Structures are given as C-alpha cells and as structure tokens.
Amino acid sequence: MGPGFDFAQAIMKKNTVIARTEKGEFTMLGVYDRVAVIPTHASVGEIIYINDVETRVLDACALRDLTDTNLEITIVKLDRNQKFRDIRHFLPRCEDDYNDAVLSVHTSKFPNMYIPVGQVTNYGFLNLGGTPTHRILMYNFPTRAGQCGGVVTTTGKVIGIHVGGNGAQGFAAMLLHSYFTD
Numbered sequence: 001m002g003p004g005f006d007f008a009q010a011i012m013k014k015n016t017v018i019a020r021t022e023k024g025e026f027t028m029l030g031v032y033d034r035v036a037v038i039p040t041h042a043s044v045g046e047i048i049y050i051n052d053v054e055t056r057v058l059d060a061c062a063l064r065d066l067t068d069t070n071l072e073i074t075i076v077k078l079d080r081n082q083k084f085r086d087i088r089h090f091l092p093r094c095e096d097d098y099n100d101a102v103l104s105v106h107t108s109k110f111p112n113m114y115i116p117v118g119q120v121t122n123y124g125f126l127n128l129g130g131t132p133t134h135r136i137l138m139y140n141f142p143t144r145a146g147q148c149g150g151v152v153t154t155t156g157k158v159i160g161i162h163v164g165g166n167g168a169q170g171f172a173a174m175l176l177h178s179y180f181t182d
C-alpha cells in the first residue's frame with residue numbers, strides 16, 4: 001500500500017522459501033548463496049522440505065551470544081541447485097530500535113501476508129518459552145502461531161525474524177550483518 005510494504009514485498013518475492021520440519025511450516029529467509037535462517041525452535045535436522053522438495057541440510061548452526069545465551073536464530077546451508085539474491089547489505093550492523101516495521105509471512109496457511117506492526121523496541125532479554133534469549137525486538141501486535149520465521153523489515157533494512165508472542169506483543173530475533181560474513 002506504501003513504501004514499507006513495497007520493500008517487504010521485494011524481499012518476500014525473491015528471498016523466501018517455505019521450510020517444513022517435523023515441528024511445522026515456517027517462513028524461511030534466504031540471505032546469500034544457499035544460506036538461510038529459521039527460528040531455532042524449528043529443530044532443523046539432516047533433511048528439510050523447501051517448497052515441498054526434499055533437501056539435504058549441509059550445515060545448521062544454532063546461534064548463541066558470547067555470554068552463551070540463546071539468540072533463537074539457526075543458520076542453515078541448503079543442498080539447493082540455486083542461490084538466493086545476496087541481501088546482506090540490507091542487514092543492520094548494530095542492535096537498534098526502529099519505526100514503522102512490517103512483518104511478512106508466506107506459508108500454506110498464510111500466503112502473501114503483510115502486517116504493519118509499527119514501532120520496534122530493542123527489548124533485549126526475554127524468557128522465550130522458558131529459554132533465556134538475548135537480542136529480542138518487540139512490537140505491539142497480537143501475532144499468532146503460524147507467523148514464526150516471518151521477516152521483519154523497515155524501508156531499506158531486514159532487521160529480524162519473528163520467534164514468538166504473548167497474545168498482545170510479538171517478538172523477533174535480530175539479524176546482524178556480522179552473522180553472515182564469509
């Protein structure tokens with residue numbers, strides 16, 4: 001409807017796939033080459049379905065900070081025959097707050113879904129499903145089951161992926177440029 005939704009659509013249309021694990025269907029953001037991200041609670045194993053195609057997982061790393069605290073991001077390298085558009089230049093370098101963000105989801109259950117979530121707070125610490133988690137972004141929108149893995153953007157930046165909520169607020173794990181240096 002406006003430039004926020006324009007940027008989010010541009011990311012969704014080239015840099016997402018539908019990922020299926022034994023724990024469900026997730027929005028999965030492709031970052032560069034065959035490297036993507038997904039919430040750690042998706043429990044990626046040796047095989048994953050990408051757009052309903054059986055795909056070998058070449059590497060999967062559940063990220064933690066240097067305090068050995070969960071970040072809820074798993075970086076996955078896929079045995080796929082095609083590269084993602086490289087979007088690493090849209091990732092922020094540092095932890096921050098944001099205005100006027102969009103949460104965008106694409107699954108079987110929720111295709112072509114875009115939510116204007118508004119102001120994003122650098123929340124920091126969250127006890128997420130009983131697990132101490134750092135680098136959490138918060139927005140005041142009643143997100144639901146089915147939105148995990150959704151991409152959080154502002155105009156010009158890809159800032160996080162949706163990892164939970166409490167019925168009133170939603171929570172995303174930050175994406176930082178430093179996670180994807182090669």
Ligand SMILES: C[C@@H]1CCO[C@@H]1C(=O)Nc1cnns1
Pocket residue numbers: 142143144145146147148163164165166167170
């Ligand atoms: C639905 C589950 C079970 C009960 O509470 C959980 C929850 O709030 N999930 C989410 C909210 N927003 N995004 S995921």
